[PDB]
Write a protein that binds this DNA or RNA. Structure first.
Ligand SMILES: C[C@H]1COc2c(N3CCN(C)CC3)c(F)cc3c(=O)c(C(=O)O)cn1c23
Ligand SMILES: C[C@H]1COc2c(N3CCN(C)CC3)c(F)cc3c(=O)c(C(=O)O)cn1c23
Ligand SMILES: [Mg+2]
Ligand SMILES: [Mg+2]
Ligand SMILES: [Mg+2]
Ligand SMILES: [Mg+2]
Ligand SMILES: [Mg+2]
Ligand SMILES: [Mg+2]
Lengths: 208, 482, 482, 209
DNA sequence: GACTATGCACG
DNA sequence: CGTGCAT
DNA sequence: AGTCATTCATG
DNA sequence: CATGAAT
């Protein structure tokens, strides 16, 4: 068990935290409310569930233990009522690679647990950028300063107050809006074909 | 070609080297500042890099790297782990390093790797290093021969007793528990006035160890044996309370646990007692500890004898353990089993050398300056002559000789005068210099007294030890029971 | 409490964020200096710390830690591996880091961890940093907003083509092989004189890649194709001799293998061919490489068709491979596929900016000085009244004011005059100063020309490129074949 | 784990027991592969005088040592059936290298005596200084006609072979049990269960100054 | 980034 | 068995 | 101080 | 199937 479980079993208020890294995973375990919050450290970039084969995809530790810790199975053999959490919360570093990780998890949950993302069950924590403020605008209102480089530089105390506490936190809630233009986006950014992607970048990415 | 050596010879030679080294320079603390060498280096290095309490955190890896390339030629993991430990407030009564990030827990889970965390010296660590720039403490060359490192720190509080140490070398090991900072200082202050004081009296100021982790210490008798001989076996019992629950069921709640005990294991072992039904009545075990408070709840069954359960957990788990003083420290380069008296007096003697050195250094600085100031006071009244005499000279050295020969300035006074910047011929105030002259004479006299009178210097030690106690004192955390 | 975003939107602000960064700031070399950000930071940081070719090796871990804490907010493994790679002379045609200790091998055995090894910049790496102190390159704030770092190095040699780069991001990868320094410089020099030069002509100077591992490169037209378009497939083949062993047996001896090929894996795969008898003939495989020479012996059986065996190994092992150009670099903040022409031309424009900037910087220095020397020459003509004036001034600021108002000195001259040491008043030799005034005027003329005349500047750039070649030129390792 | 010699010859071949994998690599690079084999020892070796013969058979380093030396262990130890003519202990010149030698020696003494009695167990002598000098005295002589080596990990493979592995260029201590009784009371005081005797040996023989 | 084993003294 | 600097 | 796996592009 | 900065 790489997992740290919630003390009492309550699929109605229970929360699963997928944290980028064992290190941040530590602060998450320490800062949490253990009654209803579980912690699952993801160790390394998550496998791309579009590019890889459903063979290797199911032989993956990070994937395989989420398939189990979540308790609903995967694919079409998947019941959303046998689940274990009301909210699955992805908590990554506020960096580029955290962005990348959010991306590889989102595509897994879309490709292989679509109902969970469809019932608005999958979230994304928003750790603070500054010391608190999240926007470049919110720091100028405080101006009347430490810049956070990772959750690994965050104390368990602070992590709670700022991003884990359901009273003092902000979670982006993933909602599959237009299934078809959403399917185009995942399949173009994460698919086997490079040229589509390259062009999507050439077209949407402002280098300057 | 080769050269033969005896097994008995080769072995003795080699183990000789390893023994001596691991005794003087690894596993055992210096009796004066209470630091193992790797701990001294961590502090010294961070302090040289200005990574103090009053400044920004700084990435741990950077600190460990400088430590490893300037002072401590060993693995980064040993250095980082030691650095980490000094930041853990359940291992140190007075933490010497402040770390941001996952620095571990009472559950013994891993600290974040040194790439994740940031650190700086704590404010009190500052006091171990105080006056280190003032030649107060003997330095040695580092392995490079590129840089000098301190062989002991100034130690403006008695770190040995206060934070403890432990402790495994060759032929000797060491365990010294942590103590309340104010109590240790009270003892030291007494012993400064009463150099022959005996344990029973010191124990009026220093009643026993004071763990960061709190709990109850039982055994006034063995504490004395320990404070007297260096060894002793005292008891340490978890602070506990009982809570009433609905349905006439009582609940055992633990809020403090014994030093050096891993909370997570303890909670499993207790739960093992329930699972194995080793004593009757345990409904469920639960860690309820969270970021602001330790709390293990042991819920009991309905008609369950809460006195039986509590007692059994005390005997057969680590809810209560024995703690064994084995106070060994390096004194005059060799290991020494020591009681409170060798410790406190070694500390007092060390603080003495430090204040004497500190005072000579400052006196010398003041004399040199005074000498310049006397020169400048004289110069102001002959300003134009001095300017004219300088214009008349051929160059720098000729200017000085002319200053000496014409007005009897000394070499050092002439050098100072001749290297003033033109603009100082405007700042022409003799009364301001006279104020400095007086301040300096007064300062030199205070310092002279210190150097020339053992009592005046001991008074200065007491007055400082008290400033530290006033500034850093905290309440006992562990209770004592005879 | 909660705010919604679309799956389509989330995956857009994220993958864009990541994509942009991996392309600009990770996997892809800057087209001008040929460095990925991690390598530039490595070089910049070690150079900031004086850890240069002419001074003692410095512990790897010290260097890495400083890079991490000051410039590069990532793991030490990655920094260290990057630093180690820049020191391996079978991966770099011209190594930029010299490392003492196990830094790996062609057999690909793990380098010692950064606690063992020690490092410093190579002399040639010095030439990548030449004039960095002269405000020659654009600087940005580090991740930390604490310190400035360079966004590109001065690159006094064309490192992109000389050392190469590889090369995997998002939507783009890069593979640019290494070339001979003298050859690449001959091409740059021709192009400086003949800007519109065509590939055919450039290839009279730069015939193709020059691997540190040597070997045989076959494919003149694909080389040309790659120099035009940045893409091309060439063949790279081991240097092989045959040796007639006694008793009618032969033996194939390999002595240079293809770039990026693990010697040990290759030796094992060739032996796999023998153990599996995929082709008949191989008696024994024997790696005979010592510390000073690469040598693999493929002993053949009596009456073994050596051409058949050789050809089979060429096709079914890495005894021979295809090498694919995919020259992508970062030009004006964005990824570009580029042939030899945009590469050399970007480099040439870069050196232009650099040399122009260097020259503005030195000229600025020379002027500030000339301006002061002019004031001093004047002061000497009026010493007596200038000392009088400072004597009459109320303080520093009033003295300067009075020097401006009464005698027209500027601020900068006033500051200099007023911060002179008293002993300077002994001098009255205007001649020494006038010699300096004249040398500065000449110095400023040379620099100002360079700035105002494109041809004078390009000559300097050629003159400097030829020096670099004369100094660091070495012979081709890899033979070329049509 | 082991890097074997290229050709089998129990009369020439050498077994280098090297402190740690990193220096293991520098010796794999600088060796003469025809007759020199490398077996890196990962970590502090198991005190075979303080521990059970059971836990001792369970130790990786030991298990692979009795195996590549290929002559079994203990009282079922047949030297003729050995694989090498020279077993060479090559550690850092730091205090911990001294310790590792100590441990290994007390193994070859307790469970492979014949190999140490026949003088087949040696100890390499890396150079302390690089200006190369081994003794502080040789140091003051080179300065007539400095990098102070902190371990084998700061040496380049070419440097290694030249100074310590090359059979022509090197010096070696040959461990030779000269007095069986006085060597037994010596490995026992130093490496054995009882702690008081050791404390006293340290107290009597180690000058702290 | 966690995990894996040893030395050393001591109850 | 577990402690903490070491390999 | 090795070892394990993942992204990304490409032939 | 590697490659090399990233997790
Ligand atoms: C010196 C090396 C030796 O090998 C080590 C271990 N092994 C010993 C051999 N076993 C077969 C496998 C495990 C180990 F378990 C942990 C460490 C370790 O923490 C460590 C460090 O520098 O912090 C360094 N080393 C370790
Ligand atoms: C960030 C962590 C993530 O975990 C890692 C690995 N695992 C991923 C999960 N697997 C199930 C077990 C292995 C790994 F094999 C290697 C590395 C590694 O080299 C490395 C580094 O900083 O250089 C860092 N990490 C690694
Ligand atoms: Mg990060
Ligand atoms: Mg370790
Ligand atoms: Mg107990
Ligand atoms: Mg790695
Ligand atoms: Mg091939
Ligand atoms: Mg060493």
């Amino acid at each position: 068990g790489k997992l740290t479980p919630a003390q009492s079993k309550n699929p109605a208020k229970n929360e699963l935290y997928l944290v980028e890294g064992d290190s941040a995973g530590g602060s998450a375990k320490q800062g949490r409310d253990r009654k209803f919050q579980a912690i699952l450290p993801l160790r390394g970039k998550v496998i791309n569930t579009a590019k890889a084969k459903m063979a290797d995809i199911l032989k993956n530790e990070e994937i395989n233990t989420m398939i189990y810790t979540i308790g609903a199975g995967v694919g079409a053999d998947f019941s959303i009522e046998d689940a274990n959490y009301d909210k699955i919360i992805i908590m990554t570093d506020a960096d580029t690679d955290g962005a990348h990780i959010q991306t590889l998890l989102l595509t897994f949950f879309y490709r292989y647990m679509r109902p969970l993302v469809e019932a608005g069950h999958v979230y994304i924590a928003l750790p603070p950028l500054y010391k608190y403020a999240w926007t470049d605008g919110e720091l100028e209102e405080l101006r009347k300063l430490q810049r956070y480089k990772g959750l690994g530089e965050m104390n368990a105390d602070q992590l709670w107050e700022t991003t884990m506490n359901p009273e003092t936190r902000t979670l982006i809630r993933v909602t599959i809006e237009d299934l078809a233009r959403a399917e185009r986006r995942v399949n173009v950014l994460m698919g086997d074909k490079v040229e589509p992607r390259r062009k999507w970048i050439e077209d949407n990415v402002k280098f300057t | 070609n080769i050269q033969n050596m005896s097994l008995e010879d080769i072995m003795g030679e080699r183990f000789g080297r390893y023994s001596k080294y691991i005794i003087q320079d690894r596993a055992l603390p210096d009796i004066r500042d209470g630091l193992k060498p790797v701990q001294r280096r961590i502090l010294y290095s961070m302090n040289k890099d200005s990574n103090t309490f009053d400044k920004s955190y700084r990435k741990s890896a950077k600190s460990v790297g400088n430590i490893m390339g300037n002072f401590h030629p060993h693995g980064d993991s040993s250095i980082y782990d030691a650095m980490v430990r000094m930041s853990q407030n359940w291992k140190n009564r007075e933490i010497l390093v402040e770390m941001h990030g996952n620095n571990g827990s009472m559950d013994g889970d891993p600290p974040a790797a040194m790439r994740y965390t940031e650190a700086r010296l704590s404010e009190i660590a500052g006091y171990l290093l105080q006056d280190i720039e003032k030649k107060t403490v003997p330095f040695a060359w580092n392995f490079d021969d590129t840089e000098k490192e301190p062989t002991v720190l100034p130690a403006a509080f008695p770190n040995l007793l206060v934070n403890g140490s432990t402790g495994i070398s060759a032929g000797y090991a060491t365990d010294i528990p942590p103590h309340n900072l104010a109590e240790v200082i009270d003892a030291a202050v007494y012993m400064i006035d009463h150099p022959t004081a005996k344990i029973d009296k010191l124990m009026e100021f220093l009643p026993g160890p004071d763990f960061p982790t709190g709990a109850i210490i039982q055994g006034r008798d063995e504490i004395k044996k320990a404070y007297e001989t260096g060894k002793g076996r005292v008891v340490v019992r978890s602070k506990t309370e009982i809570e009433k629950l609905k349905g006439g069921k009582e609940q055992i709640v633990i809020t403090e646990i014994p030093y050096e005990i891993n909370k997570a294991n303890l909670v499993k072992k207790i739960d093992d007692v329930r699972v194995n039904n080793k004593v009757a009545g345990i409904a469920e075990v639960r860690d309820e500890s969270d970021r602001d408070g330790l709390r293990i709840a042991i819920e009991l069954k309905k008609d369950a004898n809460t006195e039986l359960v509590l007692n059994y957990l005390f005997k057969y788990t680590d809810l209560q353990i024995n703690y064994n003083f084995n106070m060994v420290a390096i004194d005059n380069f060799t290991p020494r089993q020591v009681g409170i008296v060798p410790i406190l007096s070694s500390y007092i003697a060390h603080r003495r050398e430090v204040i004497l050195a500190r005072s000579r250094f400052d006196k010398e600085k003041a004399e040199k300056r005074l000498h310049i100031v006397e020169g400048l006071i004289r110069v102001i009244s002959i300003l134009d002559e001095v300017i004219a005499l300088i214009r008349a000279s051929e160059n720098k050295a000729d200017a000085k000789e002319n200053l000496k020969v014409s007005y009897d300035f000394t070499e050092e006074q002439a050098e100072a005068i001749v290297t003033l910047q033109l603009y100082r011929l405007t700042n022409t105030d003799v009364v301001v210099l006279q104020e400095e002259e007086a301040e300096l004479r007064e300062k030199i006299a205070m310092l002279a007294a210190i150097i020339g009178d053992e009592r005046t210097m001991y008074n200065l030690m007491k007055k400082e030890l008290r400033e530290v106690k006033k500034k850093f004192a905290t309440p006992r955390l562990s209770s004592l029971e005879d």
